[PDB]
Design a protein around this ligand. Structure first.
Ligand SMILES: Nc1ncnc2c1ncn2[C@@H]1O[C@H](COP(=O)(O)OP(=O)(O)NP(=O)(O)O)[C@@H](O)[C@H]1O
Ligand SMILES: Nc1ncnc2c1ncn2[C@@H]1O[C@H](COP(=O)(O)OP(=O)(O)NP(=O)(O)O)[C@@H](O)[C@H]1O
Ligand SMILES: [Mg+2]
Ligand SMILES: [Mg+2]
Lengths: 297, 297
């Protein structure tokens, strides 16, 4: 209970629109502590579609309860006719827009370290018996280039076909195994530098082509071993899909020799930050706990 | 790897925050190369040291400031040896403790005052273990990270550079003989506590500094703060003793102020004190998540 703070409307203000999605509008905001004169920047998500507040609050307590360096915690809530969710502000934005804007300068060690971190987050959520149901590059937030976090779980509970497991499309079944499917699509988005999955295919026909065996194609930089994993994520038989613990191991092993599983021109020019740059980044933007990025042997 | 060398072209000063004996502090924005983000920083541009010091020696002294690790001391994060000396530290939106206590002159509870005395002495004890003499401890040189977490800044600047001599904070032997030690810092600590317990009064108000040495040798000191039990005031008096080695040591100051904080209303007499408690568990959880990712009654 002590992890969710109930904000009052006068305590905070919206100052800029950061974008919008299926479930609401995200704003940059400013949190005015009562009696103080400081302006603390936040991210506010205002839901869409104004006794349901008990429901909403009880899921908000679960969202506020997640303590993992690769999943964003819900910090606070304001309950007016539109529910408002307050979270930490990530000025780098989402990983989808990050990889699109850096399509010509992202090195192999970044890409592989991101999928390790996304797996760690999803593994934590699976250990909590929590199903995300909307994993995608757009829903991974860049806190620093070296540290990314999953966002927006639980929002679906209270339609992204091209990221959905087949059984989710046909039968609205969501498990940790269908999250693994969306993880595969997420990895594919990153390895393609933000391509749209199944570009040119109507979403209404995705379940037809999936049943016939068709899958997203092999990104030009992915070796065979990396494409295998992604394909193992899209198995029809969910119980045959890898588990999140397995993906951590697999992507950490590849991150220890990144230039053997990703082939990208200029890959030499693009290693992880110096110890110096990492200390500087962390002191200004990221002082929370974290397991170190896996470096090449 | 703790001190980042910054290029003039990757950070720009914005609004002047204030000026003191060592230089001018700006609010600035760090812009990492290749990125689109603006990261707020504080920049202290230094006055010309009338000690004409070599660049590399400045680097060596900056490394020591960059190598302090303690929750109640501010780290030097970056430096630029431009055409001037520019120091990059984390921006504290709450500003110095002195202005904080003045603006909240009568909503500062005993729990906050005593806890602040504890934290300041911890950071000074840390400096003493590292054999670092501050020389300019004052409430203006304690920064408020959150109201519940403060930090000592500007240590070693008086060392580095050589009006601007805070005579009213100096121990007798520093005014008389230029003797700066850790026991000399304990005197300035005592004065700092006085500033706190008076809600930011100017010490020896109305007395010129040329007279300070004279009135100390006559035996008169700062007067008992209206809120201070003799228990607290006896501590302050001990800091201002003539023999430097009879003054308290910081770790004893840590112990005694921590003992008093466990029964704060027995050591400070504040009207409406029970209404000014330390934040609820939720409120600090939220404060820390947003601002501070790094003793109760
Ligand atoms: N905490 C945050 N800080 C900064 N930007 C954020 C934050 N949360 C979300 N955003 C951005 O706000 C925009 C809208 O996010 P959102 O409303 O979740 O839509 P979406 O995630 O892109 N699509 P979806 O999540 O499937 O509904 C996106 O560009 C996100 O990158
Ligand atoms: N990192 C920081 N973040 C925010 N405010 C700061 C920071 N550093 C300093 N300030 C504020 O800026 C003011 C001006 O800086 P400064 O030159 O140190 O003045 P001063 O501390 O009052 N005098 P001095 O005893 O020489 O240090 C300080 O009084 C602080 O309130
Ligand atoms: Mg989202
Ligand atoms: Mg100062």
């Amino acid at each position: 209970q002590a992890l969710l703070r109930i904000l009052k409307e006068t305590e905070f203000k919206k100052i800029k629109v950061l974008g919008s999605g299926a479930f609401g509008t995200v704003y940059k905001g400013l949190w005015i502590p009562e009696g103080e004169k400081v302006k603390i920047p936040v991210a506010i998500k205002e839901l869409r579609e104004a006794k349901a507040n008990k429901e909403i609050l009880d899921e908000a307590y679960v969202m506020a309860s997640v303590d993992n360096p690769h999943v964003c915690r819900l910090l606070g809530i304001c309950l007016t006719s539109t529910v408002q969710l307050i979270m930490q502000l990530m000025p780098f934005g989402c990983l989808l827009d990050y990889v699109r804007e850096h399509k010509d300068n992202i090195g192999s060690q970044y890409l592989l370290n991101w999928c390790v971190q996304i797996a760690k987050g999803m593994n934590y959520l699976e250990d909590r018996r929590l199903v995300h149901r909307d994993l995608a590059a757009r829903n991974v937030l860049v806190k620093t280039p070296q540290h990314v976090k999953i966002t927006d779980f639980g929002l679906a509970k209270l339609v992204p076909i091209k990221w959905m497991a087949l059984e989710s499309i046909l039968h609205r079944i969501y498990t940790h195994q269908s999250d693994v499917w969306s993880y595969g699509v997420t990895v594919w988005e990153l390895m393609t530098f933000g391509s749209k999955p199944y570009d040119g295919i109507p979403a209404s026909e995705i379940s037809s082509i999936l049943e016939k065996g068709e899958r997203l194609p092999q990104p030009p930089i992915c070796t065979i071993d990396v494409y295998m994993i992604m394909r193992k994520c899209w198995m029809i038989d969910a119980d045959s899909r890898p588990k999140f613990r397995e993906l951590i191991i697999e992507f950490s092993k590849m991150a220890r020799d990144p230039q053997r599983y990703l082939v990208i021109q200029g890959d030499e020019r693009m290693h992880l930050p110096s110890p110096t740059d990492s200390n500087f980044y962390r002191a200004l933007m990221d002082e929370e706990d974290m397991d170190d990025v896996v470096d090449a042997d």
